[PDB]
Short mmCIF file of C-alpha atoms in Angstrom, two decimals:
data_model
loop_
_atom_site.label_atom_id
_atom_site.label_comp_id
_atom_site.label_asym_id
_atom_site.label_seq_id
_atom_site.Cartn_x
_atom_site.Cartn_y
_atom_site.Cartn_z
CA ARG A 1 -4.04 -14.67 14.56
CA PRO A 2 -1.73 -17.69 14.98
CA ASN A 3 -3.31 -21.11 14.57
CA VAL A 4 -6.98 -21.92 15.24
CA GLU A 5 -8.72 -18.76 16.51
CA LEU A 6 -8.04 -17.15 13.15
CA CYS A 7 -11.75 -17.30 12.45
CA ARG A 8 -13.85 -16.36 9.42
CA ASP A 9 -16.29 -14.52 11.65
CA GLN A 10 -19.02 -11.87 11.38
CA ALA A 11 -16.46 -9.08 11.78
CA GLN A 12 -14.52 -10.50 8.82
CA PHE A 13 -17.80 -10.71 6.86
CA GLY A 14 -18.59 -7.07 7.62
CA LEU A 15 -15.08 -5.86 6.81
CA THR A 16 -15.06 -7.72 3.47
CA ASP A 17 -18.42 -6.52 2.22
CA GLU A 18 -17.75 -2.98 3.48
CA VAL A 19 -14.55 -3.07 1.40
CA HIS A 20 -16.55 -4.18 -1.65
CA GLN A 21 -19.24 -1.56 -1.04
CA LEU A 22 -16.58 1.12 -0.55
CA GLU A 23 -15.07 0.23 -3.92
CA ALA A 24 -18.52 0.52 -5.53
CA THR A 25 -19.15 3.83 -3.73
CA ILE A 26 -15.86 5.38 -4.88
CA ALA A 27 -16.66 4.23 -8.43
CA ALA A 28 -20.09 5.91 -8.24
CA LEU A 29 -18.65 9.22 -7.00
CA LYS A 30 -15.95 9.22 -9.71
CA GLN A 31 -18.67 8.70 -12.33
CA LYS A 32 -20.71 11.55 -10.85
CA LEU A 33 -17.66 13.84 -10.78
CA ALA A 34 -16.92 13.09 -14.44
CA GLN A 35 -20.54 13.81 -15.41
CA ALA A 36 -20.60 17.10 -13.49
CA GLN A 37 -17.32 18.31 -15.00
CA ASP A 38 -18.68 17.43 -18.45
CA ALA A 39 -21.63 19.68 -17.60
CA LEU A 40 -19.11 22.36 -16.57
CA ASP A 41 -17.36 22.11 -19.95
CA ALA A 42 -20.77 22.61 -21.59
CA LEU A 43 -21.29 25.73 -19.44
CA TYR A 44 -17.91 27.11 -20.51
CA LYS A 45 -18.67 26.51 -24.20
CA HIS A 46 -22.07 28.21 -24.02
CA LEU A 47 -20.58 31.09 -22.00
CA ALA A 48 -17.93 31.70 -24.68
CA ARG A 49 -20.61 31.58 -27.39
CA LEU A 50 -22.60 34.17 -25.42
CA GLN A 51 -19.47 36.34 -25.12
CA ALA A 52 -18.97 36.31 -28.89
CA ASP A 53 -22.58 37.07 -29.76
CA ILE A 54 -22.81 39.89 -27.16
CA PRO B 1 -3.87 22.67 -23.60
CA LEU B 2 -3.84 25.14 -20.69
CA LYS B 3 -6.83 23.20 -19.32
CA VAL B 4 -5.01 19.90 -19.84
CA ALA B 5 -1.79 21.20 -18.26
CA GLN B 6 -3.42 22.70 -15.17
CA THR B 7 -5.63 19.62 -14.72
CA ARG B 8 -2.67 17.23 -14.96
CA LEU B 9 -0.57 19.28 -12.53
CA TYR B 10 -3.51 19.73 -10.14
CA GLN B 11 -4.26 15.99 -10.11
CA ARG B 12 -0.57 15.19 -9.61
CA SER B 13 -0.69 17.67 -6.71
CA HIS B 14 -2.88 15.10 -4.86
CA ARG B 15 -0.25 12.35 -4.59
CA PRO B 16 1.21 11.23 -1.23
CA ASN B 17 4.14 13.04 0.31
CA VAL B 18 7.14 10.89 -0.65
CA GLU B 19 5.90 10.55 -4.24
CA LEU B 20 4.93 14.22 -4.79
CA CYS B 21 8.50 15.50 -5.03
CA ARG B 22 8.86 16.41 -8.75
CA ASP B 23 9.15 14.27 -11.89
CA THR B 24 10.36 14.56 -15.47
CA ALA B 25 6.73 14.85 -16.60
CA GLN B 26 6.24 17.51 -13.91
CA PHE B 27 9.18 19.54 -15.26
CA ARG B 28 7.90 19.12 -18.83
CA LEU B 29 4.41 20.33 -17.87
CA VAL B 30 5.77 23.31 -15.89
CA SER B 31 8.01 24.37 -18.80
CA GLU B 32 5.27 24.06 -21.40
CA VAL B 33 2.97 26.20 -19.24
CA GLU B 34 5.41 29.05 -19.89
CA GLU B 35 5.74 27.98 -23.54
CA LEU B 36 1.95 28.21 -23.94
CA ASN B 37 1.99 31.60 -22.17
CA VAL B 38 4.44 32.89 -24.80
CA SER B 39 2.32 31.35 -27.58
CA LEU B 40 -0.93 32.95 -26.37
CA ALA B 41 0.84 36.32 -26.01
CA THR B 42 2.08 36.11 -29.62
CA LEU B 43 -1.36 35.09 -30.93
CA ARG B 44 -3.02 37.96 -29.04
CA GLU B 45 -0.56 40.46 -30.56
CA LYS B 46 -1.19 38.99 -34.02
CA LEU B 47 -4.96 39.25 -33.50
CA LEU B 48 -4.67 42.91 -32.46
CA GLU B 49 -2.57 43.74 -35.53
CA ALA B 50 -5.10 41.91 -37.73
CA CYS C 1 0.19 -36.70 34.16
CA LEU C 2 -3.25 -36.40 32.54
CA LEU C 3 -4.03 -33.22 34.49
CA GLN C 4 -0.61 -31.87 33.47
CA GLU C 5 -1.34 -32.33 29.76
CA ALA C 6 -4.79 -30.74 30.21
CA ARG C 7 -3.10 -27.82 32.00
CA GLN C 8 -0.61 -27.39 29.15
CA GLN C 9 -3.19 -27.24 26.38
CA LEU C 10 -5.59 -25.01 28.34
CA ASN C 11 -2.62 -22.69 28.97
CA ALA C 12 -1.93 -22.60 25.22
CA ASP C 13 -5.58 -21.81 24.44
CA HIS C 14 -5.69 -19.11 27.14
CA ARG C 15 -2.53 -17.41 25.84
CA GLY C 16 -3.98 -17.50 22.34
CA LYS C 17 -7.08 -15.73 23.61
CA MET C 18 -4.84 -13.21 25.43
CA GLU C 19 -3.20 -12.11 22.20
CA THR C 20 -6.47 -12.35 20.23
CA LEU C 21 -8.08 -9.88 22.63
CA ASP C 22 -5.00 -7.68 22.16
CA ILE C 23 -5.32 -7.77 18.35
CA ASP C 24 -9.08 -7.20 18.22
CA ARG C 25 -8.92 -4.45 20.86
CA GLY C 26 -6.34 -2.71 18.68
CA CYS C 27 -8.70 -3.17 15.72
CA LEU C 28 -11.54 -1.58 17.69
CA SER C 29 -9.24 1.26 18.78
CA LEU C 30 -8.18 1.97 15.19
CA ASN C 31 -10.16 4.77 13.52
CA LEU C 32 -9.95 7.61 11.00
CA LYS C 33 -7.17 9.82 12.56
CA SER C 34 -4.75 6.96 13.19
CA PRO C 35 -1.13 7.39 12.02
CA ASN C 36 -0.52 3.81 10.78
CA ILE C 37 -3.40 3.61 8.30
CA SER C 38 -2.39 1.94 5.04
CA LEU C 39 -3.91 0.36 1.92
CA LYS C 40 -3.34 -3.39 2.19
CA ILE C 41 -2.83 -6.07 -0.45
CA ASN C 42 -5.35 -8.95 -0.77
CA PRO C 43 -7.24 -7.86 2.37
CA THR C 44 -10.35 -9.97 1.68
CA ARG C 45 -8.42 -13.25 1.71
CA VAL C 46 -8.92 -16.51 3.58
CA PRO C 47 -5.50 -17.57 4.93
CA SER C 48 -4.56 -21.24 5.05
CA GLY C 49 -5.55 -22.14 8.60
CA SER C 50 -8.93 -20.44 8.84
CA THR C 51 -11.54 -22.07 11.06
CA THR C 52 -15.26 -21.41 11.32
CA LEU C 53 -17.40 -20.46 14.32
CA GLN D 1 11.90 -12.22 14.90
CA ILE D 2 8.16 -12.60 14.17
CA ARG D 3 7.39 -9.09 15.40
CA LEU D 4 10.38 -7.58 13.55
CA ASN D 5 9.21 -9.38 10.39
CA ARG D 6 5.71 -7.96 10.78
CA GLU D 7 7.06 -4.44 11.46
CA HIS D 8 9.16 -4.35 8.30
CA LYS D 9 6.25 -5.91 6.40
CA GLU D 10 4.12 -2.97 7.60
CA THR D 11 6.75 -0.49 6.37
CA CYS D 12 7.02 -2.07 2.91
CA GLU D 13 3.27 -2.27 2.43
CA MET D 14 2.90 1.39 3.43
CA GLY D 15 5.34 2.07 0.60
CA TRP D 16 3.05 -0.05 -1.58
CA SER D 17 0.00 1.98 -0.51
CA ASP D 18 1.72 5.24 -1.46
CA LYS D 19 2.72 3.59 -4.76
CA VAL D 20 -0.89 2.60 -5.47
CA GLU D 21 -2.29 6.06 -4.71
CA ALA D 22 0.33 7.63 -6.99
CA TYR D 23 -0.43 5.10 -9.74
CA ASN D 24 -4.20 5.61 -9.48
CA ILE D 25 -3.71 9.36 -9.86
CA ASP D 26 -1.08 9.24 -12.60
CA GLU D 27 -2.84 6.69 -14.84
CA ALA D 28 -5.85 9.02 -14.93
CA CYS D 29 -3.38 11.82 -15.68
CA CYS D 30 -2.14 9.74 -18.63
CA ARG D 31 -5.73 9.05 -19.72
CA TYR D 32 -6.28 12.79 -20.36
CA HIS D 33 -6.23 14.06 -23.95
CA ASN D 34 -6.88 17.31 -25.80
CA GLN D 35 -10.47 16.56 -26.87
CA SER D 36 -11.29 15.16 -23.43
CA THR D 37 -13.84 16.41 -20.94
CA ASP D 38 -13.28 17.10 -17.20
CA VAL D 39 -10.32 19.49 -17.51
CA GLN D 40 -10.04 22.94 -15.92
CA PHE D 41 -7.53 25.81 -15.68
CA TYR D 42 -6.60 25.46 -12.03
CA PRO D 43 -4.71 28.58 -10.87
CA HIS D 44 -0.92 28.63 -10.84
CA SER D 45 0.46 27.84 -7.40
CA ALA D 46 3.24 26.11 -5.48
CA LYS D 47 0.87 23.24 -4.59
CA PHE D 48 2.11 21.44 -7.72
CA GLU D 49 5.67 21.48 -6.28
CA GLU D 50 6.22 20.06 -2.78
CA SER D 51 9.23 18.15 -1.47
CA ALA D 52 9.73 14.94 0.47
CA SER D 53 11.81 12.56 -1.70
CA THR D 54 13.12 13.40 -5.20
CA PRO D 55 13.10 10.58 -7.85
CA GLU D 56 16.68 9.54 -7.04
CA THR D 57 15.82 9.59 -3.32
CA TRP D 58 12.47 8.00 -4.23
CA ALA D 59 14.21 4.99 -5.78
CA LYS D 60 16.76 5.18 -2.94
CA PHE D 61 14.27 4.66 -0.11
CA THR D 62 12.41 2.09 -2.21
CA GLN D 63 15.65 0.10 -2.60
CA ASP D 64 16.43 0.66 1.10
CA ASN D 65 13.19 -0.85 2.36
CA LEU D 66 13.32 -3.72 -0.17
CA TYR D 67 16.90 -4.53 0.89
CA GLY D 68 15.89 -4.38 4.55
CA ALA D 69 13.02 -6.78 3.86
CA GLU D 70 15.50 -9.13 2.19
CA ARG D 71 17.79 -8.89 5.23
CA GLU D 72 14.86 -9.67 7.53
CA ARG D 73 13.96 -12.74 5.45
CA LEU D 74 17.55 -14.06 5.52
CA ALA D 75 17.72 -13.49 9.30
CA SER D 76 14.49 -15.44 9.76
CA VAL D 77 15.84 -18.30 7.60
CA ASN D 78 19.00 -18.48 9.74
CA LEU D 79 16.82 -18.56 12.86
CA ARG D 80 14.79 -21.40 11.30
CA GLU D 81 17.95 -23.45 10.70
CA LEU D 82 19.04 -22.75 14.29
CA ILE D 83 15.64 -24.03 15.50
CA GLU D 84 16.10 -27.20 13.42
CA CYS D 85 19.55 -27.94 14.85
CA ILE D 86 18.52 -27.08 18.42
CA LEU D 87 15.46 -29.33 18.41
CA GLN D 88 17.29 -32.26 16.80
CA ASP D 89 20.11 -32.03 19.36
CA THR D 90 17.63 -31.70 22.24
CA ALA D 91 15.61 -34.80 21.29
CA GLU D 92 18.75 -36.85 20.55
CA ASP D 93 20.41 -35.94 23.86
CA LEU D 94 17.38 -36.62 26.05
CA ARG D 95 16.65 -39.94 24.30
CA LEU D 96 20.25 -41.05 24.96
CA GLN D 97 19.97 -40.01 28.62
CA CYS D 98 16.74 -42.00 28.99
CA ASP D 99 18.33 -45.10 27.44
CA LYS E 1 5.45 9.83 -23.09
CA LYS E 2 6.92 11.18 -19.84
CA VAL E 3 3.77 10.39 -17.84
CA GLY E 4 3.68 6.84 -19.24
CA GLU E 5 7.32 6.39 -18.27
CA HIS E 6 6.34 7.39 -14.74
CA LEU E 7 3.52 4.80 -14.82
CA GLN E 8 5.98 2.09 -15.87
CA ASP E 9 8.47 3.00 -13.13
CA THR E 10 5.74 3.02 -10.46
CA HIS E 11 4.45 -0.33 -11.75
CA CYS E 12 7.93 -1.88 -11.50
CA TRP E 13 8.42 -0.65 -7.93
CA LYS E 14 4.89 -1.78 -7.00
CA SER E 15 5.56 -5.28 -8.34
CA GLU E 16 8.84 -5.50 -6.41
CA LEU E 17 7.08 -4.37 -3.22
CA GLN E 18 4.35 -6.99 -3.74
CA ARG E 19 6.95 -9.73 -4.22
CA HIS E 20 8.86 -8.75 -1.07
CA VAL E 21 5.76 -8.51 1.13
CA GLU E 22 4.54 -11.91 -0.15
CA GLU E 23 7.93 -13.46 0.64
CA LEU E 24 7.85 -11.90 4.12
CA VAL E 25 4.34 -13.28 4.73
CA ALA E 26 5.35 -16.82 3.69
CA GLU E 27 8.52 -16.64 5.81
CA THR E 28 6.50 -15.42 8.81
CA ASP E 29 4.00 -18.27 8.44
CA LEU E 30 6.72 -20.92 8.30
CA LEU E 31 8.58 -19.41 11.26
CA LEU E 32 5.26 -19.35 13.13
CA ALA E 33 5.13 -23.10 12.51
CA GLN E 34 8.70 -23.43 13.81
CA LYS E 35 7.81 -21.53 17.00
CA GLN E 36 4.70 -23.69 17.36
CA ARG E 37 6.89 -26.80 17.12
CA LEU E 38 9.18 -25.28 19.78
CA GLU E 39 5.99 -25.01 21.85
CA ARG E 40 5.46 -28.76 21.60
CA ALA E 41 9.14 -29.19 22.53
CA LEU E 42 8.47 -27.22 25.72
CA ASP E 43 5.26 -29.18 26.32
CA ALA E 44 6.89 -32.60 25.88
CA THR E 45 9.93 -31.72 28.02
CA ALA E 46 7.74 -31.72 31.16
CA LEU E 47 6.64 -35.34 31.61
CA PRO E 48 10.33 -36.48 31.52
CA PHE E 49 10.94 -33.91 34.26
#
């Protein structure tokens, strides 16, 4: 917007805090993915131990 | 290292189009996949002979 | 002369609101499927020239 | 010139967006190690090898859009100087005619 | 080593792209001011008419 109607308005407020919340959300899902794949590595280790003892 | 190789190549298979058109690291990973295949084959033969 | 200067600045304000409706209507039309979606730099910035409500 | 400037700005920042997605993936690729978690043997496929712009062509189109952005900025500067000269001549001429 | 080299190359190109888009933004703002001054030239060339 050129000169004076470039306005820090409610739409700009919503876009900015949705950007911040989206960053937080993507961080939370990456943390959850890392935790779940750590659990998967634990499953693979215990499965291999079961294979050996069987 | 097979896990590391396949995970690195799979993650790099998520890049955008103009970037996901091969790299020196990509060639290195692809070649050492075959190198590890040869190594596992040799270790399996050694285990059977043991 | 006074009415002429009032006409000129109201014309400027009206043309500004023309293009502002164009820009914000494009923003409302933009959605997830659009072919010009990008990841912008410093998007939560306040440019020099910002006014309040 | 304003709308051409904004169009080429859009092109260069789309290049930046692709750069950032590639960097965000490849730094996590670098962060991997042998004792690390969250690794899996994904099956061998051609998905790891697609083709749009090889590293030489990658740097080529990067240099192309950067050089075009430079050309756009020089063209805008020449237009600015033209605006300066035009407005100075206009004011000077009409003031002389009034006198 | 090869992956880190790719990171460094992408970082260099990303920095160059940031510099060019910032220069384009500043140039666009100043040329907007020049057009806006041309608008007062058009406005003030009417009362002499």
